[PDB]
Amino acid sequence: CGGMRRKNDTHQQDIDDLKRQNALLEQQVRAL
């Protein structure tokens, strides 16, 4: 084991980033 956080971080970043976008996205869609 020598690439757990490295790989997880890549997924966590892309993930948490997608949620931040989708969250704000739908938040605006609700208005329109």
């Binding site: 084991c1 690439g3 757990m4 790989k7 997880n8 997924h11 966590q12 892309d14 993930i15 997608l18 949620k19 976008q21 989708n22 996205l25 739908e26 605006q28 869609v29 329109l32």
Partner: protein, 32 residues
């Protein structure tokens, strides 16, 4: 550490799920 592949597999598939939702939200605003 024991099954990084398994845990990592979910992180990948989970990302794809959010990705589909992202484009969907854009289609609802862009298309619709």
């Amino acid at each position: 550490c024991g099954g990084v592949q398994a845990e990592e597999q979910k992180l990948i598939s989970e990302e794809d799920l959010l990705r589909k939702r992202r484009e969907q939200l854009k289609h609802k605003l862009e298309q619709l």
